[PDB]
Swiss-Prot record, chain A:
It catalyses: 2 reduced [2Fe-2S]-[ferredoxin] + NADP(+) + H(+) = 2 oxidized [2Fe-2S]-[ferredoxin] + NADPH. FAD binds at residues 15, 34, 42, 47, 87, 122, 287, 328. Binds 1 FAD per subunit. Transmembrane segments: none annotated. This is Ferredoxin--NADP reductase. Its cofactor is FAD.
Length: 340, 341
């Protein structure tokens, strides 16, 4: 059956997470969906280890620390997360009400939709090697679902983080041959992955080429080889049936484009009092939105979530009059927070 | 005498006034802050220092005092100048923009930009119900100390039972001719060191204590000579006093914000939602003093407001500065301003 919820939030970046808090203070429950395999969006994917200095009231917190703190704060409302899943279509079916379907065919029905999509859908980054589009699907792969597909062929893996290293090690001894290429001979993922890999190099079972891929060989989108340029300005050929780039993730607008929102420069325009869109029952908070003076700051997304929540309750509970209470002095609110 | 020149003058040192120092500082805009309270932090610090707050984004739980202390950390790298126990009384436009701003103690500021972060209003001494709406107020009923020489060898009536009342009894007792303290209950809830030095004064014959409420005052020409207290037995009793000092605590009134020609709406300053500027270019309003469609009296909104205000205020302070949006996390320029090395 379809999963029914008061609110569906697209994204579990900082601004999507905090929205759980503000919606929870008003007894509005939420499911969140993110194509990333972790909560925290950009903070968690792009700068987890790095210090942030402009979260009001925290002199310094890390990307990861912030993520972990927001998860604490929202833990008392019982949000339901669906990670590694992509929101694809939205269809208006109530006044308001929305049917929202994920890439794995999961279906939600919610009263209110909150777009917290941020910079966009995180997706595998395309490596910067001319003519790349063509081999995509056939012989350039950004994921391994069935590893049996790669037995006894020549594999080019490009990259040098955990995913690259995991796939090199797992796809040997399946492979006929393989050539790992990274820009530099320096690996994060240490110590265990990095050393098993260097064991494969030293044993002749893996060939390492330090550099970057400058062109590809193959007709009808089927690979046969690749040119690498090494760090001595020398080129060299590689034999490969398959190239698997692991250059990390990147953010593209994605499905937000296909939901009949009146975008402006790939941003959703929004009322400055309620952070609602053009479509009643659809809100947008965080870096996905726009309004005069908008700033892509975490702290703004917070404000935006708080004001959105005020509007979204009136759709979820229309007969109920909202009485403004403070978290510090209201025991009703403290009861919702699980403070005795 | 000489006017204090600054880029920005901030009215209030509540959470939202304090955070505005941060956002102005990321853009090399310096600030003076002025509050009539004797401490930073506004409501969080005066009304709920020891209470837990749960809706500061990213902090599961912080206290009124903890938040105040955390904000003072965050803004420390920019070197704000505070003027506490002082009140902003008048503002006058003198540039395009530019303001001359004078405090109740005749201090004068000249600033390019004014940021009203007045919150719930100025904190002020509450009237006791004597009726105390009084003849005596200019001259022998005082809500604050002038200089302490004013009270040498005077008979002093102090009414109240919190820290202030107790601080003034103890500080004025060595010089007073005589002193009576009156509070409605024989229970003192302020800091227990004060409470006990006070009871030392009672027990030593240096202080008269009377438990009850003042019902009547004695004196023509607005000059006190005594007072009637009703004790909790409906019994009355007479007190000799040249001066009555009520310390019933603080309360927030709109105050001087009403006298600056701003177009108010329900005692709130209307404001552009993109810049948090007012009707008067160069004057901004952030925090609980403001209004706009959707406004919520939340700390976290005042933060947003301060950030967007800063963006506009820099164009006045540095009109040839082209502003570039950078992140604290990734920009070494910003990290240089923060004193991260
Ligand atoms: C290097 C760097 C440093 C930064 N430093 C600062 C700083 O100091 N201060 C500051 O305030 N800000 C900073 N930012 C900005 C901050 O990262 C963003 O403001 C914040 O991430 C926005 O949060 P959000 O919740 O709106 O969305 P994001 O963090 O962008 O997360 C949105 C999530 O939505 C997902 N998504 C989008 N569409 C879909 C879909 N259809 N289905 C499923 N999932 C979807 C994405 O996978 C993503 O996880 C920085 C950004 C970067 C890159
Ligand atoms: C009991 C209680 C619980 C609360 N709980 C919460 C909560 O859980 N979460 C939340 O977000 N908010 C809460 N708030 C609200 C929060 O305290 C306010 O939104 C916040 O204090 C606004 O701060 P601000 O900087 O705008 O001004 P304030 O804290 O109002 O600071 C204003 C300061 O300005 C000064 N001032 C005004 N005019 C002048 C003048 N002319 N000259 C000099 N000084 C002047 C005042 O003396 C005061 O110190 C609570 C409030 C109360 C009373």
């Amino acid at each position: 059956e379809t999963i029914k919820t008061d609110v569906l939030i697209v994204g579990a970046g900082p601004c999507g997470l905090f929205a759980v808090f503000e919606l929870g203070l008003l007894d509005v429950k939420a499911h969140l969906v993110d194509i990333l395999d972790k909560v925290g969006g950009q903070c968690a994917e792009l700068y987890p280890e790095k210090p942030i200095y402009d979260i009001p009231g925290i002199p310094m917190v890390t990307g990861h620390g912030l993520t972990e703190a927001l998860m604490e704060q929202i833990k008392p409302f019982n949000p339901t997360f669906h990670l590694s899943e992509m929101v694809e279509n939205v269809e208006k079916i109530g006044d308001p009400g929305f049917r929202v379907t994920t890439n794995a065919g999961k279906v939600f029905e919610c009263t209110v939709l909150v777009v917290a999509a941020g910079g966009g859908s995180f997706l595998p980054k395309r490596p910067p090697v001319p003519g790349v589009e063509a081999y995509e699907g056939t012989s350039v792969h950004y994921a391994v679902r069935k590893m049996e597909d790669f037995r006894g062929k020549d594999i080019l893996i490009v990259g040098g983080g955990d995913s690259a290293l995991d796939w090199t090690l797992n796809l040997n001894p399946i492979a006929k041959s393989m050539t790992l290429v990274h820009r530099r001979d320096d690996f994060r993922g240490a110590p265990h992955s990095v050393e098993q890999m260097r064991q494969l190099v030293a044993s002749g079972k893996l060939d390492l080429k330090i550099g970057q891929i400058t062109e590809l060989q193959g007709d009808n989108g089927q690979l046969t080889g690749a040119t690498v340029k090494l760090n001595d300005n020398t080129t060299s050929q590689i034999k490969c049936d398959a190239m698997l780039p692991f250059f990390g993730l990147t953010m593209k607008l994605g499905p937000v484009a296909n939901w009949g929102l009146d975008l402006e420069n790939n941003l959703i325009p929004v009322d400055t009092g309620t952070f609602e869109t053009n479509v009643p029952g659809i809100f947008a908070i965080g870096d996905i939105n726009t309004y005069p003076g908008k700033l892509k700051l975490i702290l703004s997304g917070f404000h935006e979530g708080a004001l959105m929540a005020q509007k979204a309750v009136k759709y979820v509970y229309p007969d109920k009059r909202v009485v403004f209470q403070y978290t510090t002095s209201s025991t009703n609110l403290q009861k919702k927070l699980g403070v005795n």
